[PDB]
Amino acid sequence: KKNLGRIAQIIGPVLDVAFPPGKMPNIYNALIVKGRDTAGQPMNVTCEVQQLLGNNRVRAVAMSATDGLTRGMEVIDTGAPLSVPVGGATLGRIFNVLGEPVDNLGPVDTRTTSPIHRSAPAFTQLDTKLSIFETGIKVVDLLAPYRRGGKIGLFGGAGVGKTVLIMELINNIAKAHGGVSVFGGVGERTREGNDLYMEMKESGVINEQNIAESKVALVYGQMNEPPGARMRVGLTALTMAEYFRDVNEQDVLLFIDNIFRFVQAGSEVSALLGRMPSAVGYQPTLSTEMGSLQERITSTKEGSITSIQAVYVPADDLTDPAPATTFAHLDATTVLSRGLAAKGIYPAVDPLDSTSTMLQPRIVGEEHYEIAQRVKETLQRYKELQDIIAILGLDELSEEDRLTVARARKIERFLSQPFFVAEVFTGSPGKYVGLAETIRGFQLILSGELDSLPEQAFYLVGNIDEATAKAMNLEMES
Amino acid sequence: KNLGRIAQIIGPVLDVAFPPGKMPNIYNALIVKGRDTAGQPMNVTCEVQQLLGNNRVRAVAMSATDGLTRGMEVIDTGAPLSVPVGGATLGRIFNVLGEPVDNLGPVD
Amino acid sequence: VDSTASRYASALADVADVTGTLEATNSDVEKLIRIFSEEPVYYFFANPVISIDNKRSVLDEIITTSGLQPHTANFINILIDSERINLVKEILNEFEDVFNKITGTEVAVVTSVVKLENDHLAQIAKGVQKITGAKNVRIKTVIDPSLVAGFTIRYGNEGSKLVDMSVKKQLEEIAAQLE
Amino acid sequence: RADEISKIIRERIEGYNREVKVVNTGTVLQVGDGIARIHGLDEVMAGELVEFEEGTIGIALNLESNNVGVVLMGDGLMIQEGSSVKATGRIAQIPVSEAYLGRVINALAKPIDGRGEITASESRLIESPAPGIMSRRSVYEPLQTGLIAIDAMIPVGRGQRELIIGDRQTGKTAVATDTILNQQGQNVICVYVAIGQKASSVAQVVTNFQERGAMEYTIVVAETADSPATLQYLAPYTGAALAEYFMYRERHTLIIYDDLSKQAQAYRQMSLLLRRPPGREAYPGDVFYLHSRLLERAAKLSSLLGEGSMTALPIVETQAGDVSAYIPTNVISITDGQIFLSADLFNAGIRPAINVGISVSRVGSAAQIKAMKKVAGKLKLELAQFAELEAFAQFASDLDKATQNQLARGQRLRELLKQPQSAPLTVEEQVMTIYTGTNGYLDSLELDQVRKYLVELRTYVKTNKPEFQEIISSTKTFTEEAEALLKEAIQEQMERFLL
Amino acid sequence: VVLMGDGLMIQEGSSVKATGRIAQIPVSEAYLGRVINALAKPIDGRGEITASESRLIESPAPGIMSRRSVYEPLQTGLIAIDAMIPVGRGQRELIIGDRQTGKTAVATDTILNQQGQNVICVYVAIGQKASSVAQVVTNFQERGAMEYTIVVAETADSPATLQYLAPYTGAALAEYFMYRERHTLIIYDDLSKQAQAYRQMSLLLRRPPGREAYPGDVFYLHSRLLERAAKLSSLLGEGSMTALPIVETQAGDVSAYIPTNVISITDGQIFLSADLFNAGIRPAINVGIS
C-alpha cells in the first residue's frame, strides 16, 4: 500500500511528481515510474527525489532515458533510497547505475542489498597508519609516493594519459592485491570498458568459469548515459567497495575513471533543477557533492579503501573549480602534463606539480627523502632557467647552470618509463621498476657518475642498468 | 490590414499589441504612425524580431523612437522590408527602407 | 497594462460579455470585493499552508450565501486551482477598469471644497463624454477642503487626465511672476 | 506564465464543471528563438514529434505542468500564434531504408537534391541508445583512407572514432572526402554530414561524388549556415541514425561529421536563447553530452549482433591550433585518436598537411593488415629519427654521411606522403610506395622527381606485373615472393625513368 | 531557513518551532583536549563535555577602547618568521600559499611551540578531509600538544552551514579564554573553504551573487570573524587572541577574490611559494612579499 504519484512535469531527466498530501517521499528516495513503450511496459525508469517543491510535489532526477514518458503516469515511491546488490554476488559482474547486471549473465543474488546514500565513517573509527604503497612507476614511487589506504588523484587534460596510467595501476597492483578491487567507470568510452572487461578476463582475474572467485566488480555508467545516471555511478561503485570494507573487512581498491564526469553530470542536472550556478556555470553545491563521495572512501579500523581516481582537467586549467575542489580530498596528486606528452615523455607526469603527503622522512625513509628533494631541487632550477635558454639558448649559461641543465635533462628522461599497457602503441615491452632500483638510479645521476653517457640513453628504460646498456649501443654503433 | 498599438517604447525597441487573430509573423515590417516635433505626421518603420506571446510582438525600429507614444496605431504590412530594385536604383543612395537619401527625387 | 492580475480579470469580463451577464457579473464582482477586504477572510484563502481541499468546501459555502453568478463561482475556483489567489485583490480591482472598456463607458473624478448639485455633475458628464467619447459617461465625487473654491476632474483610461481651476491659479501666478 | 493568456483562461471558466481530454491537439502560445510553447497536448510523450499547420515538425521536450516546450525543427517564421498542433504519436524518428543511397538529404531526412520522394519502410530513433558494454568487440578490420600518412602511421580501424582536427582551410574536408572516395571496392556505406557549411561547398562535394561514382554508397546530410540552429543541432543525429540502419543490418558504415564544432555552436545558440546558464566560452554544460551521445554510437559490434561497424570521423576546427580550447578538448576525450592537420604544413605545400608526430590512434597495430604492420613499422621509426635530425641540422652545417644520408632520405619520405586531392591510393600501392622510399631506392632522385617517379612506378605494376597485387589482396602479407617481385619492377622503372 | 544538517527526513508541511535564541555554544575549561563539532559536541568519542556557561557564536568584536597595542611576542619557532615577519599576541597573521606548500605545517609548528608558553590553542579545520584532521590530532596528541589545544573539525561530508559556523564556533571558544585573562591562538585551516560554504548557502537562498558568485557580504564574513582576534586592554584583564588564518591560492593567484579580501583584513601575511618549496628552502617563506 505504497503512496502513488503522478508525473506533473518532464524537463529532460528531471521529473516533478505530484503526490497525495498525507504522504510525501523523503529526499534521496527512489521513485519507480510505470513507463510505457511501443513493445511492452518498462518500469525501468527509476528516479531519485532531490527537492520537495511544495503543493504536494517533489522534484526527482531520472536514472534512464525519459523519452516516452507522459504527464500523468503512475509513480511508485519505493520508500527507501536507491539500493544496490553488494557482496560476493557482485564479483565478476558488470553493473548499471541501478545495480543491474549488464554482462548478459544470470540475475544477481539480491539477498544482500545496500543503499547508495550512507553517511561517512565517524571520526573515531578512522585509522591513522601511514603505510607507503609501491606501484612500479619511477615518477610515482620516487617523487609522489602513494598512500596505502587513501585517496589518489591523476590530473590532466584530454589525451595526456590518465587512462593509460590508471590501467598500469590496475596491472601492477590489482593482481598483487590481497583483496577485492572495484572499478567505477563514470563517463568514459564504452570501448574502454569493453577493453578492461577483456583485460580482466585475459589476465585471469574475471574467470569465465567459477565467476564467484574473481575479486573484481565492475560498475559502468559511461558517456552515452543520461546525466542523472552519471551522478550516481560513483556512489554505486563506492557502496560496493564499502561492503567489503565493513562486512567482509577486506582491503579494497577503488578505481574511478573519471570523477570529473561525476561533477560535470551533477552540474548538468543542477541546471535543470533551477539552481543558481556558481563560478564557471557549476552547481552551487559543488564542494558538498564532491565531499560526499570522497569522505566515504576513507579507511576504517576494520578495512581500507585505496582509491585511484582520474580527474579530468578542462582546458588544461588546474584552477578550474572541479579540479580545484578535488585537491583537498587527496593524499597524493599525480598531475600529468601536456608539454611532456607533446615531447613523447610517458607517463607525462609533471615531477614538480605532483605532490604527496607521504614524501616525509619518517614515512619514506631518510635515503629516499633526501634524493626526492635533490631531484626536485634540480628540476626546479632547470625550470627557472627556461626563460634564459628560451631566448639566448644554452650558450650563455654559467658553468654551474649548464651542469644543472645537463643533469636535469637526464633526470627528465629517466623519469619516463615503458608500460605493459602501452605495448600496443610502441611495441616496446614494459618494465616494472622497484623503489630500490629507483632510488639507486637517481643516486647515479645526481652523483654524476653517469655524466658521460648520452641523454637518450635514459629515455624509456626500466633500470639504470638498461640506461647503461642503451648507452653502449648509442656509443657502439657506427 | 492590421492595426496594432504600441505597448511599450524602451530605447529603439518597441512592443506592439495586436488583436488576437490578426498577427504579424517574424521579420515583417511595422509602420508606426507617429507625429513629429512640430505636429505633422511622420511614420516610423520597424521590424518584428520577437513574438512575445499574448498577441504582442517586439520590434526594433529602423529610425528614431524619440517622440513615440504608447498607444499609437501601427500598420502590419504582412511582408518584410520591401525595397525598390531595378535600373531605377543605379546611381542612387538609399536608406535602409529603400528611400533615396541623395535628394534627387523619388525612385520611379 | 498587461500583468497577471490584469490578465485574469480580462478573461472574467470576456466570458460575461459573451453570455450577456455583464450587469449580472459586475454586481457579483463588486460583491466579492466586500468579501475579500477582511484581513481574516483574505488570509485564509491566500496562504499556502491551509489545505486546498478545505478551501474549496469553505468557498462553496461562501458562494451559496453570496449567491454569485455561475461563472463567477468558477472564476474563483479557477484562481484557487492555479495558485493565483494571492493576487485576488489586484484582479478584482483590475476588472472594474476592463468592465468600463467593454461597455464603452468612461469614468471621471470631480473634486470640490463643498458638496455640489446634480445638474453640475450632469454637465461635467456631458463635457467628459464630449472630449472623451464615452459611449456613456460616469462620475465620482471626493470632497477635499485644502483647495480654494474650484473643481478638479480626473478621467482617462487610467486616473490620468486632469483639468482644474482652484489653486492652479495661485501656483500658476507664482510660476508666472518668476518669469 | 505562458498559459495565462486570457483566451486559455476564458475557455477554462466556461468548462470548469466538465471532464475533458485535450490530449490530441493543442494551441501555439508563442514562437520565438527556436522553441514553441504549446497549450494542451495532455498525452504527448517526452521526445515526441508534433506537427503544425504550416508543416513544421517539432520535438516535444519540455513538458511543463500547463504547457509543452516544443523544439522547432526548422524556421518557425510562419507558425501563426493560436494555430493548431498535432501529436504524431511517433517519438523522434526518421524514416530510413536502402533508398537513401545516392540522395542528398536534409536533417529531417527530406530530399533536397531535387530528385523526388524517397520510399522507406522502417524507422530509427534520432536519440537512440549506443551499444552497451557487451554488444561490442575489438576494432580489428582496417578502414583504408587512401592517404598514406593515415593508413601507414595513424591507421583507422572499422568501428573507431577518429578525430580530424585542424585550423580553417587545412584540408579537413579533403581527408574526409578522400576516405569516402576510397570505399568504392569495399562494402562500406559512407554517410557525409555537413553541419553549418557553405551550400556552395556542399554542392562541390556532392558533384565530386557524382563525378567519381562515390554517390552509389553515400548519403549526404546537408545543413547550411543559412539553416536554423536546431536543424544543425539535429543533423548529426539524423546522419548517425541513417548509419545505424546499416550497422544493425550487418553492414559496415562510415559517418563523417563536418564541423562537430558547428554543431556545438548551434546548440550553444539554442541554449543561450533558451536562457540556460552557460560555462566555459559560453557553451552550456550539456556540450560534452551533446557529442558523446553522438560518438558512442560508433562501435564495432559483436558477432552476436552481426558485426556491423560505424567508423566515425568527426571534424573539429581549432582557432590558431588551440587544442586546449573547450570544444576540441571535449571531443579528444571522446574520440579514440586524432589526426592533426597543421597550418604551417598546409601553407608550405605539404598537402595533406598531416602532423604525423602529434597524431595518435588508439588501435594502431590492430587495424593495419600484415603487409602494413611489417612495412610501415620502418616508416614510423625513420620519422622518429628524422624529427631529431632536422633539429641541429643548420646548427651543425657539416653534415656527415651518418646524417646527410639520413636527412636526404627523410626529405623524400615526405615526398612519399604527399598525395594530390581526390586521388586515394590502394593498399597495394601504399605498401609499394613506403617500401621503395624506406630502402633508399629514391635517393638519387631530386625532390621534384619523386612525385613523378612513383606515379610511373604504380602504373608499371598495374599493367605489367599484376602478381604483386594478387599477393597483397589475397595473403594480405608482405611475402618474400612479393618483395622480390616488387624489386624486379623497381629495377625496370629505374631503367625507364632515366632515359 | 538554512539547515544545520541534511534535510532528508523533513516533511513538507510539517511543523517547526522557533527556539527563542540565537546561536549559542556550551563553553568551559573542559574543551581542552577534545575534538569537537561546529556545535561544540565532542566527536572524538571520549565522553560529554561538562560546560555551564554559554557564549554567542556571533558575538561582537572588542572596540577601539577595549584594546591595547600588540606588544608581546608569539613565538613560532621558525627563524624566518620570528626575525623578519614577527607575530605578536593580538595579531592576525595570514598564512597564504598554494596547495601543498607548507601552510598547515607552519601553523601546526606554531601550536606545537606553545608547549610551555601558557597559551590556549584552537585548531579550526573547515572542509578538510577527516583522515587529514585525524592525522593532525594524532600529531598534536603525541607531542602533548593536546593538553592545551581544542580542535574544531568540520569535514567536507558535513553540510555547508556547519562549515560556515566552524570558525565562529572556534572563535567563541577563544573569546572564552581571551576574556578570562588567558592568551589564545586560533588557526583557521582554510578560510577559503569557509567562503565556499557560504557561497553555497547564499546561492541556494537565491541571493544575488557577485565576483566568482560569492555574495557581497563575504568580506563582512571574514571581517567580523577576524576583528574578534585582538589584544585587550589592562582593564579587560589583558588577554589576547592571535588569529592565524589560512588561505590557499591558485598557482599563486592573489588576484583571486577571496585571497584579496583576507589579505586586506589581517595584520600581515606569510607567503609560502612552491618555487622556494621545491628548491629546498623550507619553510618556504617568500619574504619580500610577506
Ligand SMILES: Nc1ncnc2c1ncn2[C@@H]1O[C@H](COP(=O)(O)OP(=O)(O)OP(=O)(O)O)[C@@H](O)[C@H]1O
Ligand atoms: N591533398 C590535397 N592536395 C591538393 N590540394 C588540396 C588537398 N587537400 C586540400 N586541398 C585544397 O585545399 C583547400 C582547402 O581544403 P578543404 O576546403 O578541404 O579544407 P577545410 O579545412 O575543410 O576548409 P574550410 O575549413 O574552409 O571548410 C581546398 O581548396 C582544396 O582544393
Ligand SMILES: Nc1ncnc2c1ncn2[C@@H]1O[C@H](COP(=O)(O)OP(=O)(O)OP(=O)(O)O)[C@@H](O)[C@H]1O
Ligand atoms: N619546514 C619544512 N621542512 C620540510 N618539509 C616541510 C616543511 N614545511 C612543510 N613541509 C612539507 O610540506 C608538505 C605539505 O605541507 P602542508 O600539508 O602543511 O601544506 P598545505 O599547504 O597545508 O597543504 P594542503 O594545501 O594540501 O593542505 C608536508 O608533507 C610537509 O612534510
Ligand SMILES: Nc1ncnc2c1ncn2[C@@H]1O[C@H](COP(=O)(O)OP(=O)(O)O)[C@@H](O)[C@H]1O
Ligand atoms: N605510456 C605511454 N606510452 C605511449 N603512449 C602513451 C602512453 N600513455 C598515453 N599515451 C598516448 O596518449 C593517448 C591518450 O591517452 P589517454 O590515456 O586516452 O589520455 P586520457 O586518459 O587523458 O584521455 C593514448 O592513446 C596513447 O597513444
Ligand SMILES: [Mg+2]
Ligand atoms: Mg582518458
Ligand SMILES: [Mg+2]
Ligand atoms: Mg570544409
Ligand SMILES: [Mg+2]
Ligand atoms: Mg594543509
